[PDB]
Amino acid sequence: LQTETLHQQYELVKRRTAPVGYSYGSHVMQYGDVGISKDNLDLYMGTNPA
Amino acid sequence: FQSGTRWAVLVAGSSGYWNYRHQADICHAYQLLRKGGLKEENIVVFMYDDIANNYENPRPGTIINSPHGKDVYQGVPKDYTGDDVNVDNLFAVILGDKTAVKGGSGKVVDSGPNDHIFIFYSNHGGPGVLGMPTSPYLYANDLNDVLKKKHALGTYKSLVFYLEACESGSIFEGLLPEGLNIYATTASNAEESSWGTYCPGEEPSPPPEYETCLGDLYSVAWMEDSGM
Amino acid sequence: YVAD
């Protein structure tokens, strides 16, 4: 259980999507007001208490 | 705590059984956001709606977004389907203008200045252009213009855009200014492909006879992350 | 894999 920001999700998504062994993959980018990425994901996607 | 309303616009830009994954991505995103507490009335769904009962679908009436995933189609509202998945309706929805909608549910993002908005698009793309299952296609300049308009209306506090398509970086790079309170990420840079995942012959593979990918890597990356 |  922990807080996740937009920035943290971007990093996780970037990592999973990146090429490894120089096969397939793509390079996740970010644009606009990157300062917003400090926001908790819950502000946009809510919280599934699970 | 946040006292504003959370809205989402979910857009699959393609049609056809071979494009199963884009509508599966969007249905999964719908279920995730509902589980997070976003209300159905605030989530606007664009999907051609030719997948769940496509004759090529090995499991009639369902859509899955991972090899052992649960159905994500049940419960998804049919806001804009078939030929109602078009750029004019998309823009009317984003701008919160019911009077500019043509066909479909009429649900729009009639948001207030303290609200948050999340937009997720998944499909096909090329430099400067995103697919739609109708003419016209969704061009980068037009999309950025409608985001600028929305900012001019002032009807959100901040907006997040997740974008899945080939050469998707091209849609925002040098076009999306700072100062709109918009944060966007893209599956790829402006010059490379983005990839499907859960594909026949790859690990992990879809169930037998699907012969189509169940999702897209950037898309399931964020949705599966949000889930855990 | 299929591309987008």
Numbering used by the authors:
A (entry chain E): 284 to 333
B (entry chain A): 54 to 281
C (entry chain C): 2 to 5
Q: Please, what does the article write about this entry?
A:
Arabidopsis thaliana encodes four legumain forms, two vegetative-type (AtLEGα and γ), one seed-type (AtLEGβ), and a separate grouped (AtLEGδ). The vegetative-type legumains, like AtLEGγ, are involved in plant-programmed cell death. Legumains are synthesized as inactive precursors, or zymogens, with a tripartite domain organization. It comprises an N-terminal asparaginyl endopeptidase domain (AEP),2 an intermediate activation peptide that blocks access to the active site and thus confers enzymatic latency to the zymogen, and a C-terminal legumain stabilization and activity modulation (LSAM) domain, which renders legumain stable at neutral pH and restricts substrate access to the active site.
For a detailed understanding of how fully activated A. thaliana legumain γ (AtLEGγ) recognizes a substrate, we solved the crystal structure of the AtLEGγ peptidase (AEP) in complex with the covalent peptidic CMK-based inhibitor Ac-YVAD-CMK to 1.5-Å resolution. The peptidase (AEP) exhibited the characteristic six-stranded central β-sheet (β1–β6), which was surrounded by five major and five minor α-helices. When we analyzed the AtLEGγ structure in complex with the Ac-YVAD-CMK ligand we found the specificity loops (c341 and c381) and the edge strand (βIV) highly ordered, contrasting the zymogenic structure, displayed in relative B-factors, which indicate the local flexibility. In the Ac-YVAD-CMK substrate analogue, there were two major hydrogen bonds between the carbonyl oxygen of Ser247 and amide nitrogen of Gly249 to P1 amide nitrogen and P2 carbonyl oxygen, respectively. The P2 carbonyl oxygen was further anchored by the side chain of Arg74. By contrast, the activation peptide in the two-chain structure was out of register and shifted for 2.5 Å to the N-terminal direction. The oxyanion hole was formed by the amide nitrogens of Cys219 and Gly178 as well as of imidazole ring of His177 (Nδ1). The protonated AspP1 carboxylate group was coordinated by Asp269 and Glu217 at the bottom, Ser247 on the upper side (“north”) and Arg74 and His75 on the lower side (“south”) of the S1 pocket. The P2 Ala interacted hydrophobically with Trp248. The P3 Val was constrained by the Cys252–Cys266 disulfide bridge and the guanidium group of Arg74.
